[PDB]
């Protein structure tokens, strides 16, 4: 009556879609160095979300992406012209979905559950990545931190899931591959499922995730129509 | 009147003291993985400070340091017992000052500049780092984030320098090697010095620092007795 999961809420980047899709195109421009440019870019992208929220300087995710691209190349000593910048950025809008995700999502819906994305992306960025993958019909709501002008893991961002879904905290399973994000949402109050894709270890940020699985299809296997 | 620099506020970790001085202890305990352990430990320490602040779950710098150390080891498959934690964690209370630092501090006071540390450190960790290196006399104020229960670069942290100095925003030159920290102060309102020791590039977080030098020694040489 208040205690059981009714909605599954996903982060977008790194749980549903692979942010290192962009390595292929970094590789073209910087031969030999696709992994490392793209590993740094993502890291500093996440850092800039954190720093701007802590500083009171919100700028949307596309902007933070560019700023992080620019730092990363200057930092690594690499020239990138305007056309490079433009193309590598446009590439964040067409990340590949992880291979378990489409079927996982059909089964979550088949088990009678609402589905939503809660993400640092702009409204546009989210619609591009989901739209470009053809999984537009798989989600009931697509929620952007645009709505509050603060990034994860600010507590006002997690609040948007329950307010959009009109559900209690215990009714929402928040799902993420990133520990620090599951941890934010758990402190907000949602039960949390950590996807441990990599065989790693949870953050020591004071909280143990309710559910741990190796992939979204496992998560899906947990529910019954 | 209220437009000229009167004090120099330093941050501690990575500007005054080398956070990688723990490297030799780490390499002894984890042979062949000591640099990695020292890099990741430090990076996850920073991320936990930013995470706790953003999630409203403050815990002091020493607690963060232990958390990060346990994460780091779990993540690398390195086992560590209770005594090894306590050992390595104690090493962080004894960081090594950069070469240039003590004499640069003697030279900045010799100009009638007030001098403070404003640090993410706890009241104990600050005293212990500054104290064990015998530099306690060179600072007029040791200020910890403990008085606000908020880590950098939250704007309330940067406020404490001007309140404790009883000075104007334009009369404090905040000095850090960490551009994200220099960036946070600048949005605060203080003029910043970015010390660029490693020879890199400043964050694309929308501000440009006011002075750049390569050393605190070089900075000290800009101030007349
Ligand atoms: Ni119930
Ligand atoms: Ni003046």
TrEMBL record, chains A, B:
The keyword Hydrolase applies. Its EC number is 3.8.1.2. It is an enzyme of class 3 (hydrolase). Keywords: Hydrolase. This is Haloacid dehalogenase, type II.
């Amino acid at each position: 009556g208040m205690h059981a999961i009714k909605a599954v809420v996903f982060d977008l980047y790194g749980t549903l879609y692979d942010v290192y899709s962009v390595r292929t195109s970094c590789e073209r421009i910087f031969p030999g160095q696709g992994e490392m440019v793209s590993k740094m870019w993502r890291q500093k992208q996440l850092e800039y979300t954190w720093m701007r929220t802590l500083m009171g300087q919100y700028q949307d995710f596309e902007s933070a992406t560019l700023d992080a691209l620019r730092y990363t190349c200057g930092s690594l000593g690499l020239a990138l012209d305007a056309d490079g910048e433009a193309h590598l950025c446009s590439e964040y809008l067409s990340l590949t979905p992880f291979a378990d995700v489409p079927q996982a999502l059909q089964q979550l819906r088949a088990a009678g559950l609402k589905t939503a994305i809660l993400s640092n992306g702009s409204r546009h960025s989210i619609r591009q990545v989901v739209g470009n993958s053809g999984l537009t019909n798989s989600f009931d709501h697509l929620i952007s931190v645009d709505e509050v002008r603060l990034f994860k893991p600010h507590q006002k961002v997690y609040e948007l899931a329950m307010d959009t879904l009109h559900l209690g905290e215990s009714e929402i399973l928040f799902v993420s591959c990133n520990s620090w994000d599951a941890t934010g949402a758990k402190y907000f109050g949602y039960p949390v499922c950590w996807i441990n894709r990599s065989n790693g270890v949870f953050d020591q940020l004071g909280v143990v995730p309710d559910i741990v699985v190796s992939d979204v299809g496992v998560l899906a296997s947990r529910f019954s129509p």
